[PDB]
Amino acid sequence: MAKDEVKARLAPVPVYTVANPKNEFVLVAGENNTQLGFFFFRKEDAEALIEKIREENPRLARDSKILRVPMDNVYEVFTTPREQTGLQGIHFRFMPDMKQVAHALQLYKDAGVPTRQFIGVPVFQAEGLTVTTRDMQYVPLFLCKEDLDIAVQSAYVQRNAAQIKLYKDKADKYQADYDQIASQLEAAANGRERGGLESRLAKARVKLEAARDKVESVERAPLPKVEVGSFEEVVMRMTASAGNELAAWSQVMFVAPELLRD
Amino acid sequence: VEAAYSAYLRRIAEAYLAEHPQMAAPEHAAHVARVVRSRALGTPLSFD
Amino acid sequence: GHVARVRFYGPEKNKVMATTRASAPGGERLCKVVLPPDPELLDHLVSNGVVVDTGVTEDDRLRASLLVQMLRYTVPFMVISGLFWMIHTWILD
Amino acid sequence: XXXXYXXXXXXXXXXXXXXXXXXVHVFRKXXXXXXX
Amino acid sequence: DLSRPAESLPARADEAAVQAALADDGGWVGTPDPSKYAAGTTQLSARELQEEVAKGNVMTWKDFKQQVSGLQGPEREALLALVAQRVAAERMFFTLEDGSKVSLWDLQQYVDNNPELAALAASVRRIAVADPEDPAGRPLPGGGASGLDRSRGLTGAAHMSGQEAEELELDWGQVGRGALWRRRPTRWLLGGLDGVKDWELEAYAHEPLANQLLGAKYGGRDPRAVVADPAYAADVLRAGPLLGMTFVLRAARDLPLQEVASSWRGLLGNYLQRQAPLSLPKAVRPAHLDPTDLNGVAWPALLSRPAAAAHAAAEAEAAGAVPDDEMGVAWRVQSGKEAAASVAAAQQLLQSLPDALCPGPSPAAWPLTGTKLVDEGGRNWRRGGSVWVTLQPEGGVLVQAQTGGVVGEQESYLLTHVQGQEALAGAVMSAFMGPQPLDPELAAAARSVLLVPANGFTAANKERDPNHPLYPSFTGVRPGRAPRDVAAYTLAGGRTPLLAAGGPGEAKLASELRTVMEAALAAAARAEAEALADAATSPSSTSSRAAPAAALAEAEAAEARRARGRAAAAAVMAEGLRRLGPDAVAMLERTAAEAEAPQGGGAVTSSDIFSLARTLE
Amino acid sequence: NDLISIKYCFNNLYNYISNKTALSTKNLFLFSLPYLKAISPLYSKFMIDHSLKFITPKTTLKLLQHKLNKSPHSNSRPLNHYNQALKLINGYEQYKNNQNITKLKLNLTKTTVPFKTLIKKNGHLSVVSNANLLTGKRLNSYLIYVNQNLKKFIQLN
Amino acid sequence: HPWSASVLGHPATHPFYEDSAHNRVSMLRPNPAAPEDVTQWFCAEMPEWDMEKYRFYVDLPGDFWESGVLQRHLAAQRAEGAVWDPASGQYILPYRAQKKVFQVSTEVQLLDPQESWD
Amino acid sequence: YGEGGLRRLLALEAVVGKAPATTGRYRRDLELLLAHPEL
Amino acid sequence: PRYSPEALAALYGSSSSKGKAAAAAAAQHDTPALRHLDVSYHGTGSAVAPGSGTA
């Protein structure tokens, strides 16, 4: 995928950074003059960083401010000559809030392989669910599991109410079935036709309530299997994509964290 | 309509062969096909 | 393939001055054609190797034509006065 | 690249060695710098 | 109309027999009488040729020699002309799509003696064609605008929209642009209008040959790292004439001829003197012309000669020399000789320039006078005309000229095709791309975007590849904007592709798919085993000889066993795929994509899995 | 001004190589305008084989691979055959050597390629409220009516 | 005028074109597909300078140009010409591109208001 | 779009064009002009 | 008018010509607009006679 399309697809979701007033990143240099940046998906994290800065330097903390940058610009920051603006080890990383990290950890371990290790920022999705416009159907990606289930519960109840009155159409047409069956079992003399239509009624109501218990078992079936991934891997696949997976990626839309609630 | 087209080809064919009894011989049976196919669509054009 | 070049002219660009090649009937001439609203003309022009040329086309339309329209209204009186002046003074001095 | 995480306090690891002790404590293996 | 074919008689005499066709005697050229000798008599014995030459039947080959020796003027001219007619009529032919043998003479007549078709081509009138099925003969749905013909009436070039330029065999991308100034302009004068340009230069290079030559060695690394070392520079300066490098000079204004000649001599003699003995490639194959079928080109066969041409090419180069590197070129530095007489002959050629174009003081007799390349006065070169110089490997230079203006009336002249001047080739290659050229940024950009296509792609992206470095090709879809109201979140959709990153489900997916391709590779391995087993246990009818043929035979037997493995793995893995479902196909396809090297057929296990992909072909 | 575009080209190329190498390692471990032109001074196959007279290839790469991949009555007009013959004779004159100024029969084709492309795959409805019956000399109208009808009657016989 | 439309030898027109024996020439051709009806035969049309002509006046509605009648007529009548038939290897002027009896070829011409000099 | 699309969905005019129906009224005279060339 | 897919299914799938004719003459349809819209056309009558004195 061309760079511009990736940039256009990431824009609706921002990140937060702390800087000087003069639009300069504040870096945490450690050993061997290697310096680490940061981008937080929640302002509380930058707030913690600045209130930790204040307790060991009040000058920078009195000058530092918080900036809300759209992920287009940070993506651009990554994939450029990092030595152009200067890099002697300016390691940018991300920081996901540990609520979603705990959600993803438990989801990860319950799926069969229990581990207490996570890499990258969680992205949630649920198969079967897709937001459709007037022309083409897009697939959404949720950064926070909260809006994920907020959407999926309404979607599930809509679709299963749909399955219920679909079965009620089946059931009214099957009241018609039983009517024609009363017109098919003993209204005439005994013999071939009538016994054949007895077996007809048997198989008919058999498949009818088999589909009943089917719709009930999907009523009994949990909400669609939620799958989780890492943001960095997602974008690395998005950039170097071509062919069929390109066509798959060309319809992803990222939802904003805490958007569906308010 | 296939019968009509065949009879149209027929008319053109016997008209042309009655016109030219010389190469109406079966030797030109494939040549007369080349000429009837041409005469059944429109008129042939020279270069000028 | 007898036409070499067309030149759209006029203030609203619907007349053309077509130039004919040497192989055309009558040699090389320049002929004026007025054009109806046909949206298939330009494809036909380009897909036959014709040098199609346009004008300058100013974008204002009202500041462009405003000093020439004033002249269109004022010059007739000048012509009439000059003609009658010729008669009754340049002769009857 | 990314940064490994372990929600023990939630330890982390980079390609220095963060420890976002829930507060913050960016250990080393001192935030006095500014980009240019 | 075309299609005037013939049969395949032996006209190329398998030149391994021509040693005998020239080292024989007692022969002649002619035909006996139809009285006692039939048509086809070529060997006339002592008594036979005796009575033939004493009766007037055929004169000896010796007699042809003494005739052509004694016959002079119109007799020898006619003899040579009509025997040239004979040879151009029944000895060299062209070969069309069918396999015909169209002579050179009849087709030459067809081209230059048909004035009506010449006049039809002179115009462009597009005459529709009728469907050869009988009923209505309505015009065919072909139509078409032919974006080359759609481009007459333009001035500079012929905008042609990609794929058309590709199917037209236009394989010379652009690499660099610069200019030759009489005076470079200065910002500090008013506007810099003092700067008067003389020529506009641009360079082109055959992109497939670039990707084959420099794409095997220099491809796949950091471009800046590859540009940092002078080995790449020495390469691109020495590997020029193998890419058919071409340079175009467009006259930015009117120019008198004499000054141009003098300036070019001055500016190239200095490169010609400070020229060191060069490195040249070594001929791996003789490559005879193709006499019987002049067009017939050999490489489509060679690059798939057994479809495993690696070892056969190794055997070919075993004779001449071994490739000094991975690119495949067996270089050769110029000797102590051939580096002094060559430059002397080149300087001799240069010293004959200014009065060859301008012999005598009256320009009316000069060659360029009489064509639109120069003014009607013959004394100035018209603005817009351009010169094309292309370099063939073994010291060949081809120069052509093209007038400027409307694409419909442009002309093209072939000026001279010199040969053997390694000095001229090296001098011009250095003048444009050497350490000290005529304009530096030209050669810098040339080296850069010449590295560009060696990574698989091409400048001027004539494949609409969504990952071209310069000019990608977008998809038509709009970037979806998520809504806030939960109303388009349908959940009624059937199946959604999996676009989440490394997760728990993807792990087990890769696990079961890896297990089944393990089984597949094991089946391919046992296929290898039993294939070579039944190959060995075959009652081989082999006479002890033909060691290179034996090598080629056993090698392609190995290739056939590889095909057995490929087919077996294809079958079993296709079973596996239709068993696992669609997401497993997506995973295998994505892995096949990412693993493939971007610069060559197969390179940087991943080799195993993308070979399984090429079996799933 | 090409230099800046070249900078961006090299940046994107390095990103391309690096991203693909990184993803390759990761996945296999988990398992285990300036340049838009073209010309052709000689036919491509001729230059290709005149060059392969000097190259020992271990394998064909992507470009040459696609070339020999695409190597193997709608155009039956005489003009098309004439053009094919012109092509043949031009090729022979090109590769035949190995006023004194000759003119080619086909113009050398210089070409430009577009950038920024895409991937390969009535009746009207007016109504009056009251129809205006013309309510609110006439002898001649009556007379012409009866005359016309009577004349039609007599012409019926 | 109906008899001046074709090159029939109808003796109501001026004798423009005559044989040696002074008879008007004709150019009818028998239309092989439909004999027995003469009004469906083919015939060449008279040169326009030798024609008698009615000159009617017509008022065109306000939507004459966007209704496309003239465009449809032009696009249909100019979409026919000579073709090449390879089944016979000839240049054919197809029948559906020739003029029947009384039909002519329309010439459309527009006038310029600036050529009035009132 | 349109009405009655179903019925809408169910000689040599393609070779010699359509017959013009505005000129039948002359047919008779034409025939005379072929039976009496002397006219 | 909306046609259910069965109609043209029985039409196209039928090989016979008059089999298609039967499938066509027998096919039915529905009209959703009868549950959504009621369209009428009126002219606002005039209250001044066009030739009178007040006009």
Ligand SMILES: CC[C@H](CC[C@@H](C)[C@H]1CC[C@H]2[C@@H]3CC=C4C[C@@H](O)CC[C@]4(C)[C@H]3CC[C@]12C)C(C)C
């Ligand atoms: C664009 C630079 C241009 C020089 C290039 C042309 C015009 C010059 C260089 C090669 C010359 C030919 C050399 C040998 C042939 C054949 C021989 O029989 C008689 C002379 C003739 C035609 C010569 C004809 C003139 C030729 C093409 C100007 C600006 C210097």
Ligand SMILES: CC[C@H](CC[C@@H](C)[C@H]1CC[C@H]2[C@@H]3CC=C4C[C@@H](O)CC[C@]4(C)[C@H]3CC[C@]12C)C(C)C
């Ligand atoms: C010189 C820098 C570069 C010019 C490139 C052209 C102008 C040079 C390179 C190849 C040369 C010719 C090879 C064969 C011909 C014909 C022969 O008769 C005598 C020698 C002559 C003229 C050679 C002289 C002219 C040629 C074309 C830039 C400054 C344009």
